[PDB]
Ligand binder design. Structure first.
Ligand SMILES: Cc1ccc(-c2nn(C(C)(C)C)c3ncnc(N)c23)cc1
Ligand SMILES: Cc1ccc(-c2nn(C(C)(C)C)c3ncnc(N)c23)cc1
Lengths: 277, 277
């Protein structure tokens, strides 16, 4: 029983699904083509996300949660929602198509200069600054949760775990322990507290992933040992393809006090100062 | 911070990990060899389960939950726990090794006669009757959660979501919506009620998977539409490789009233009557 919003409902007969682009804990995403989308004559190459054959109740809640947050945002660096098919069969979410795939895969498949990586971090920081202005916390901010559309333009994705900056619900059942530990902020890891400043912590780990072309954060460190490491003040070390100014930004994102961490508005200007220089 | 039980702690220096056997929502399972296990001189081919590099707090809780339930059971058709490495690094669970892999994959890879399939259902019903005697509900009973060791002997696995038949804890934080809908009992789907009779419902779906050699239950039916179908009394249809007596057993497992469903003790005798005849 899903409410069908007419502003986003799309006819299933006007949608042809193609080959599977990926399947896992996120769901089932297939490539597809949608004709007469948004009233524009012709067809459009899109991406359709659906539940798996072995989906659980929580898997639907995330797809509906992802559906809600995508109806409310709009940004050239946040994946765009085009339509949905909530009636007469399976639930399909029709969104923008990212040719080059997820960012974690795109970085691993690599020729990219250091200017290309700072551009990626700049785009992600731009969209995140917008989400902060939209009163949203992403929580699940990582390299795997970022898409790469055509033009190598970064697109923020996976809003199934996102919450409001101001809780606008009388009773919200709390999701528990669904954020990977190595991307969790120390206060989120210690008291289940997720904020925009916690996304900055997650963004700092994202910077580490980009400068390493899809590296595994805290290498060889069991995630069950990371709480003790972060509680004592230990962070990650300087990687190989990192400058003195770039590594300083990661540590500012990893400051213990969330007030001592920069906001995404400052991160965008800090990263542009690296692009110009 | 994990408590190290000396009855199950095993030295990491006495364990060599090999190639990865599988990775996903369940965790990371690698093939390995353990020397001087259980005091027996020599080495033993085992399987080691560990957390992923992007594991979340709940992923650890399941591994610890799976660890607890495996310390307490023993059956030739339930996977056997051999040891663990909870100190000085990553958390490793050392259990029995299943050469032929998961049951869902083993059925799909297939020459098997109808007698071979009833034998598999018999073995799974035997171990489940034992778990019911051990006051345990498995909940996540499916074909993917069953292993096939050497000799094509069935081994019940994945106890991360298992609960006690009698709740022996003052405050237990409830996991929510982690069982795939198509395997959920109608009362579990309607009021979050998981019991041994609900495992019989799940076992009936497992029978359907075996007689179809790893088929997808309720084919072409969106899992969001299954609650309405089961609430109106509709079940699955007779498959192709199913007898009149075998299909009757599935429907008895799918009876609305859980008291109207058979117990695993009767299922073992019902399946043996098919093996003899
Ligand atoms: C709502 C929604 C829908 C689809 C996706 C998505 N996942 N993925 C994979 C997982 C294949 C990289 C994609 N690859 C390309 N384009 C996409 N749009 C996606 C993400 C969110
Ligand atoms: C505690 C525990 C440890 C390992 C496994 C396990 N998963 N898997 C896959 C997923 C590769 C089929 C296995 N394949 C063979 N043998 C095994 N033992 C396993 C299950 C539970």
């Amino acid at each position: 029983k899903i409410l069908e919003d007419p502003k986003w409902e799309f006819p299933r007969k006007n949608l042809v699904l193609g080959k599977t682009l990926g399947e896992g804990e996120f769901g089932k995403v297939v490539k597809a083509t949608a004709f007469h989308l948004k009233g524009r004559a012709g067809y459009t190459t899109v991406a359709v996300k659906m539940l798996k054959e072995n989906a659980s109740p929580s898997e639907l809640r995330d797809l509906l949660s992802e559906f809600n947050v995508l109806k409310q945002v709009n940004h050239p660096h946040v994946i765009k929602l085009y339509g949905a098919c909530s009636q007469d069969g399976p639930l399909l979410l029709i969104v923008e198509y990212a040719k080059y795939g997820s960012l974690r895969g795109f970085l691993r498949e690599s020729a990219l200069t250091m200017g290309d990586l700072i551009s990626f971090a700049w785009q992600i920081s731009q969209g995140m600054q917008y989400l902060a202005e939209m009163k949203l916390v992403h929580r699940d901010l990582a390299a795997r949760n970022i898409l790469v559309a055509e033009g190598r333009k970064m697109k923020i994705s996976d809003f199934g775990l996102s919450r409001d900056v101001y809780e606008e619900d009388s009773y919200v059942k709390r999701s528990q322990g669904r954020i990977p530990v190595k991307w969790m902020a120390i206060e989120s890891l210690f008291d289940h507290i997720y904020t925009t400043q916690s996304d900055v912590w997650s963004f700092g780990v994202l910077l580490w992933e980009i400068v390493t072309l899809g590296g595994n954060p805290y290498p060889g460190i069991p995630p069950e040992r990371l709480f003790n490491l972060l509680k004592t003040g230990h962070r990650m070390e300087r990687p190989d393809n990192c400058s003195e100014e770039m590594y300083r930004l990661m540590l500012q994102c990893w400051k213990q006090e969330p007030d001592k961490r920069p906001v995404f508005a400052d991160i965008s200007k800090d990263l542009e100062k690296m692009m110009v220089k």
